[PDB]
Amino acid sequence: KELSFGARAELPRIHPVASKLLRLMQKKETNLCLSADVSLARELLQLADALGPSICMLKTHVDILNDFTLDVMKELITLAKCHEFLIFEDRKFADIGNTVKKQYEGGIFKIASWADLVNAHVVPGSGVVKGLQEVGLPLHRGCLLIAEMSSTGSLATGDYTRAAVRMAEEHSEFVVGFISGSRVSMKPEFLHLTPGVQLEAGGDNLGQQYNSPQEVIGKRGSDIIIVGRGIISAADRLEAAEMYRKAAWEAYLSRLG
Amino acid sequence: KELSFGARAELPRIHPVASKLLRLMQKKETNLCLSADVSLARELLQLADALGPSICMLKTHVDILNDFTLDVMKELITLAKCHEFLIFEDRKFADIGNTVKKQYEGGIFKIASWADLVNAHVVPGSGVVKGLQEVGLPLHRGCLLIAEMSSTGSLATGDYTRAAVRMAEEHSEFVVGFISGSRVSMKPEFLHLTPGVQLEAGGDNLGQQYNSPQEVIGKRGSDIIIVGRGIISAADRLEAAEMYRKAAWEAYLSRLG
Ligand SMILES: O=c1[nH]c(=O)c2[nH+]cn([C@@H]3O[C@H](COP(=O)(O)O)[C@@H](O)[C@H]3O)c2[nH]1
Numbered sequence: 001k002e003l004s005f006g007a008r009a010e011l012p013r014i015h016p017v018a019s020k021l022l023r024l025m026q027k028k029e030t031n032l033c034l035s036a037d038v039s040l041a042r043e044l045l046q047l048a049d050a051l052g053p054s055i056c057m058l059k060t061h062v063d064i065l066n067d068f069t070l071d072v073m074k075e076l077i078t079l080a081k082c083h084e085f086l087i088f089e090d091r092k093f094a095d096i097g098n099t100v101k102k103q104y105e106g107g108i109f110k111i112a113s114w115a116d117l118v119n120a121h122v123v124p125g126s127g128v129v130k131g132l133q134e135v136g137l138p139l140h141r142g143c144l145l146i147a148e149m150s151s152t153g154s155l156a157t158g159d160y161t162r163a164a165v166r167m168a169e170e171h172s173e174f175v176v177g178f179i180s181g182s183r184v185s186m187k188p189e190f191l192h193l194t195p196g197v198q199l200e201a202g203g204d205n206l207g208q209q210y211n212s213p214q215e216v217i218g219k220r221g222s223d224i225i226i227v228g229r230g231i232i233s234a235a236d237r238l239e240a241a242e243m244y245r246k247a248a249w250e251a252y253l254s255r256l257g
Numbered sequence: 258k259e260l261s262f263g264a265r266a267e268l269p270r271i272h273p274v275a276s277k278l279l280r281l282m283q284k285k286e287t288n289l290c291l292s293a294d295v296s297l298a299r300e301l302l303q304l305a306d307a308l309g310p311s312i313c314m315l316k317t318h319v320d321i322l323n324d325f326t327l328d329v330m331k332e333l334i335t336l337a338k339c340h341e342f343l344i345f346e347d348r349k350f351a352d353i354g355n356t357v358k359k360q361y362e363g364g365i366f367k368i369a370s371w372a373d374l375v376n377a378h379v380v381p382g383s384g385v386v387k388g389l390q391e392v393g394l395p396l397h398r399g400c401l402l403i404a405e406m407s408s409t410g411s412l413a414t415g416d417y418t419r420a421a422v423r424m425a426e427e428h429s430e431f432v433v434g435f436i437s438g439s440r441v442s443m444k445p446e447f448l449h450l451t452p453g454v455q456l457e458a459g460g461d462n463l464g465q466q467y468n469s470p471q472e473v474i475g476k477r478g479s480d481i482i483i484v485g486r487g488i489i490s491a492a493d494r495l496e497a498a499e500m501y502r503k504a505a506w507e508a509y510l511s512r513l514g
């Protein structure tokens with residue numbers, strides 16, 4: 001039987017990052033993650049500020065920020081704290097453990113220094129998790145494993161997906177959940193986040209397919225919707241965010257009973 | 258009867274980037290790609306200068322450079338042209354097409370502006386290739402697809418690998434070859450680059466495993482060895498590079514017969 005976000009936050013095996021997330025979701029009645037896919041620091045921060053009350057999480061691609069500095073991230077963390085949301089860097093770590101450790105801690109981005117959550121592809125095998133965890137465990141960070149993809153011709157199906165779940169379950173000290181299209185694990189300590197979400201049917205010219213918040217949360221058993229263009233491209237980003245929040249939240253409430 | 262690199266450079270369906278690469282490999286008697294896994298620009302540039310004559314390609318992880326600027330890349334391009342090697346940014350693009358085009362063209366790194374070659378995981382479906390090529394084709398760049406990985410528990414096996422090969426064949430205007438452990442394509446227009454290479458047997462504690470140049474080039478039929486710590490960790494990186502070059506080159510010569 002399904003526990004609320006609030007109750008899942010208190011589970012014995014729950015990761016502290018997952019717990020923080022689950023509490024603010026329950027408190028704010030939001031299971032929406034904004035995908036802030038913009039190329040300017042100014043717009044990133046304006047959206048984070050205006051939409052922060054509507055969201056549980058702000059997902060970034062800092063490698064697309066034309067004017068990235070660590071100070072932009074400082075400002076982002078202030079908004080995260082003020083409005084209460086987690087920052088998820090959608091880096092999709094996908095190298096060998098020795099390499100991803102450096103990409104996570106170092107370079108220009110210093111992702112580990114500001115990102116509550118990052119994600120990884122599982123294709124390299126568990127060394128990818130092991131490398132990230134050397135940096136992320138001391139910094140009290142969490143990781144999401146890419147179990148399925150939204151895009152057309154995704155190879156993250158069947159046994160690949162089962163491998164992702166196995167890897168998460170065996171690295172629960174650092175791995176807090178999945179990027180997936182549906183519920184992939186039966187353990188309620190794990191989060192499921194689902195991109196490829198819009199209110200209306202369709203896709204884009206480059207392989208992306210869409211499903212509705214009611215489908216993903218209500219029918220497919222996911223926890224959080226990740227929404228980019230469905231919000232960012234809208235004229236009124238605030239009413240768009242509210243629309244997605246209310247959709248995903250009501251879908252969750254009806255699944256719960 | 259196997260074609261030399263020089264003959265392959267003239268193949269009717271050869272990609273211009275592959276052709277340029279194959280011709281300098283022939284000219285300089287090198288099928289060594291230096292994996293320049295360093296965090297300081299000065300060491301990067303000193304290695305590229307000293308080892309440039311011994312290598313056909315210099316592979317970078319720009320996201321690990323503590324003092325990255327576009328000017329560092331300018332200086333690297335100069336050395337690349339002076340010594341005749343290609344620059345390969347090992348970015349492992351792995352998002353949906355819409356995102357990867359932004360990550361390739363834009364952000365701080367502007368990878369497409371200086372990288373002859375980049376690579377991609379095939380997990381997202383062919384959208385990842387379609388995305389990169391929107392940027393890459395107009396800039397006369399090439400892409401390598403990751404068909405296999407060297408690390409323990411790699412899921413790039415069986416149908417996953419066969420999928421990578423199909424995806425390359427179907428996007429030959431942009432895809433010039435593979436990262437793999439062995440020959441995966443019968444078509445000689447495609448390059449095979451193989452990481453996880455050292456003169457001695459062994460591995461690291463984050464899932465990396467090693468095979469020799471002789472095994473990789475001679476027995477498994479790959480074209481180019483990618484060598485990081487085998488060279489970088491040596492006192493004399495120039496003599497180390499020469500050892501790897503001679504090993505890989507002679508293995509290639511003995512395969513041709
Ligand atoms: O880890 C992932 N697995 C997926 O299946 C997937 N599909 C889309 N994306 C990323 O999510 C965002 C989607 O943005 P749109 O709502 O604008 O399509 C963008 O930021 C994309 O990069 C994915 N990430």
Ligand SMILES: O=c1[nH]c(=O)c2[nH+]cn([C@@H]3O[C@H](COP(=O)(O)O)[C@@H](O)[C@H]3O)c2[nH]1
Pocket residue numbers: 095096099292294318347376403405406407408436452453454465483484485486487
């Ligand atoms: O695309 C890839 N598929 C692979 O299977 C693989 N194995 C290692 N690497 C990368 O290659 C370099 C190898 O470094 P070492 O020689 O120091 O182990 C390092 O830069 C690693 O990031 C891989 N890249």
